[PDB]
Design a protein around this ligand. Structure first.
Ligand SMILES: [Zn+2]
Lengths: 213, 61, 135, 24, 101, 82
RNA sequence: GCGCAAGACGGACCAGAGCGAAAGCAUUUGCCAAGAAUGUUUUCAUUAAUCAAGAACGAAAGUCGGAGGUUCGAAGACGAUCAGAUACCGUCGUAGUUCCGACCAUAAACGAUGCCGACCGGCGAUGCGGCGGCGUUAUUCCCAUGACCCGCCGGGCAGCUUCCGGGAAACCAAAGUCUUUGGGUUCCGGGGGGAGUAUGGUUGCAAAGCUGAAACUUAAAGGAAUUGACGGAAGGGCACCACC
RNA sequence: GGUACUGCCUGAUAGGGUGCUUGCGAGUGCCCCGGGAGGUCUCGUAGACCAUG
């Protein structure tokens, strides 16, 4: 009958100043008929983007959830939302002869943003090791867990969203945790496997404007 | 595109009734490309086969 | 009829490929995923209940949807592959691999391949019964 | 089969428990 | 006559094990008994590799791999021929098959 | 095997055998004499020492107890007695 | 695709690994009390082994009250298959599955192997504590401590191996130390059916549980292993009276 | 003084990760500069998985 695809319009999703490459892409939104504002229906999107696409030198398995908030007239302003590992990597890590270790913290940053940060680590096989399995006793595991918690808590609690994501991109936090826990047990692969968002501060234009440029 | 094929080795005979012959294919274009291929009727080593679809691969009957 | 972009740059859509043992979906959307560009299903193309899943259904479906989207200005496709998930099969249906191959034939550019099957931490009970489904 | 004639025995026994009541 | 010394299951020194749901069946089987087969393969299979490799926007993009843990009740395995019966003495050998050439 | 002197074991083996299974029951622990470097005082301490032992005047903590043996604090010399 | 809610369940990691008297027991964090092994030149000085009566716990289902109802789901209702299916397959779906509070005391509750103790061949592995030992690592030197690495000791779960010896044999380092028959003790079987039925007693709200016959009937019923023949089992193999 | 080598990342020419050369397995090479020529590096190669009688 009537082509719905002629009432559609093209917009440009561009990332924040945090990463290198700016334009993540195009988004398709039906035009305003006045009953429904197209700026509003476009306001709530999550964008799943690979880290390799935003910054040229990094690994593929880090994905970022990015939220549009304000529309600039065919420019979409995106703020950080979430982060996660590609399923493939996640599975690639897990194996049958090693202890896995997990922990999480709920931290308010200095600008008020509320984040759930997840941490995954592994008992590493030693280099000359004859014994088939690497296993950490429960107390050791609890120790390591406690230290992860401590570390990332200290990392986020001191700083605002900016520096946090900046630490998330290379993942300074992971190598931090690996390094520090070497006394308890030689951890292997250690990441922030997921980042969640619980409470955003009341929306302010200026903050986001600063964040973009 | 139509291409040409060279026979490197005869492997086995695929078929229910054991009809087809599974034969390994070099390319006559001097390329080192190697593709397994099914051929009907008698084949001995050294023959050239005419391929209408040249990117296809061999499956087990 | 779509985005205005130079010859060098490719417009990215995202392709959800859903392969069960029943039938396959090849469904292309925006990057947000909140707008559907086009959806073709394995059982819409061929008429029979037996053929719904089979690699051919996915062939047809994929060729068609990739055509319709090659119309609207999307050259490149990010692919999120799916198996039915939940309590049931984590293994992807037969149609998926054939469908992907199919719309790769169509001249479309391929983005990053991701595998999303919803995966329980721990599930509610499976649909069968203690002794299983016997046949 | 054992399980089933055990069951049948309990049926029969319940029935006998009905046909002879302490009122009789 | 006792068939296996281990009774088909890995259970030793513990009373009861958590039951799991069959991949194929849905038939309930204890985790110890359950035939487990791990599967590491590629998302796209043999020919469509060389096919899609050309359609990429990326250079040297390595195909993701699918990882699936499988559980089969004793029946289903012998059906799918994932496992087949062997001779009385040869049964005793728990050394896994030589897929390593 | 089929010939052994159960009467004359080699001292090494007897060091190896569990303390109660020896030809005669021999305690595996000894009284040791501990000396803190900063003070003159000598203190008699049991090899595997529960609790915690102290040098009186200096309030020096000599050793922490552990599962197997008490472990002396660093730099403190010791001599097995006899 | 975005959010919201509810109730269940803790995947992968997870193993012939651990813990418990046995049922059984895997998200984080704290609180509460236990417990084995180990270490000990501590203390008591025979207090100990096994157990009729009698007591504590006891999967699932089941039953009463309460809360709760996502999934699955007996009953039921359809749709199919079928000669017939009130069945296997499929859609719907009650009780129940879940939590709290009272009952029930039964499982192929199985290592189908009572408990305490002594002796009797090796060999690698593992878990936990201890002891000792070059050398690596937590960056460069000193001690701690942790991770590997090489041994020894005591408990554990197991494994492999063997003309120790058993055994009807399968198999078993216990099922060994048995006509060369006696370390202590509890429970308990006496051809197969009839029957774990009848009856009485007893426990329970109920379903049932525990105790438990006889009349009669019958030459076998049974256990291991051995050749066969068969299998709608898995493998190979041949034939133009099989096909291509 | 004699005499070796030397991919990238971290934290030493050590330690710890991780690579490219031909799909794989070997070899070989991969710090910096200058200059010089010689170029489809060599040897092997299964890599095969979508009822009634
Ligand atoms: Zn099954």
């Amino acid at each position: 009958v009537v082509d719905p695809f002629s009432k559609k319009d093209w917009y440009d999703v561009k990332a924040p100043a945090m990463f290198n490459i700016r334009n993540i892409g195009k988004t398709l939104v039906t035009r305003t008929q006045g009953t429904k504002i197209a700026s509003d229906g476009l306001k709530g999107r999550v964008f799943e983007v690979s880290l390799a696409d935003l910054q040229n030198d990094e690994v593929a398995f880090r994905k970022f959830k990015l939220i549009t908030e304000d529309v600039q007239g065919k420019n979409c302003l995106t703020n950080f939302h979430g982060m996660d590992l590609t399923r493939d990597k996640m599975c690639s890590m897990v194996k049958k002869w090693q202890t896995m270790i997990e922990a999480h913290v709920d931290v308010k940053t200095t600008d008020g943003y509320l984040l759930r940060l997840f941490c995954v680590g592994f008992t590493k096989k030693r280099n000359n090791q004859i014994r088939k399995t690497s296993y950490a006793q429960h107390q050791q595991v609890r120790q390591i867990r406690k230290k992860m918690m401590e570390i990332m808590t200290r990392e986020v609690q001191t700083n605002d969203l900016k520096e946090v994501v900046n630490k998330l991109i290379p993942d300074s936090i992971g190598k931090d945790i690996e390094k520090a826990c070497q006394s308890i047990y030689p951890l292997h692969d250690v990441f922030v496997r997921k980042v969640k968002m619980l409470k955003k501060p009341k929306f302010e234009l200026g903050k986001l404007m600063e964040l973009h440029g | 595109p139509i291409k040409l094929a060279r026979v490197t080795k005869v492997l086995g005979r695929t078929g229910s009734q054991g009809q087809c012959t599974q034969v390994r294919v070099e390319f006559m274009d001097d390329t080192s490309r190697s593709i397994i291929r099914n051929v009907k009727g008698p084949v001995r080593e050294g023959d050239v086969l005419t391929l209408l679809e040249s990117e296809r691969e061999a499956r087990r009957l | 009829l779509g985005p205005q972009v130079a010859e060098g740059e490719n417009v990215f859509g995202v392709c959800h490929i859903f392969a069960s043992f029943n039938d396959t979906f090849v469904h292309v959307t925006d990057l947000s995923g909140k707008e559907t560009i086009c959806r073709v299903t394995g059982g819409m193309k061929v008429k029979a209940d037996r053929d719904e899943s089979s690699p051919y259904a996915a062939m047809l479906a994929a060729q068609d949807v990739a055509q319709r989207c090659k119309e609207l200005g999307i050259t490149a496709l990010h692919i999120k592959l799916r198996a039915t998930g939940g309590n049931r099969t984590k293994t992807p249906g037969p149609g998926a691999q054939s469908a992907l191959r199919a719309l790769a034939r169509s001249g479309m550019k391929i983005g990053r391949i991701e595998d999303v099957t919803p995966i329980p931490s721990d599930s509610t009970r499976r649909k069968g019964g203690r002794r299983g489904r016997r046949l | 089969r054992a399980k089933w004639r055990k069951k049948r025995m309990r049926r029969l026994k319940r029935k006998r428990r009905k046909m002879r009541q302490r009122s009789k | 006559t006792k068939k296996r010394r281990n009774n088909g299951r890995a259970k030793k020194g513990r009373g009861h094990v958590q039951p799991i749901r069959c991949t194929n069946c849905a038939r309930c089987v204890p985790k110890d008994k359950a035939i487990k087969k791990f599967v590491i393969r590629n998302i796209v299979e043999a020919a469509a590799v060389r096919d899609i490799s050309e359609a990429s926007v990326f250079d040297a993009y390595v195909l993701p791999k699918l990882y699936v843990k499988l559980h089969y009740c004793v029946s289903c395995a012998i059906h799918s021929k994932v496992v087949r019966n062997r001779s009385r003495e040869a049964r005793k050998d728990r050394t896994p098959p030589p897929r390593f050439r | 095997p089929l010939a052994k002197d159960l009467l004359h074991p080699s001292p090494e083996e007897e060091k190896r055998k569990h303390k109660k299974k020896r030809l005669v029951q021999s305690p595996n622990s000894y009284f040791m004499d501990v000396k803190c470097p900063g003070c003159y005082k000598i203190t008699t301490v049991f090899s595997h020492a529960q609790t915690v032992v102290l040098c009186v005047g200096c309030s020096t903590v000599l050793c922490q107890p552990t599962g197997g043996k008490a472990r002396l604090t660093e730099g403190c010399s010791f001599r097995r007695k006899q």
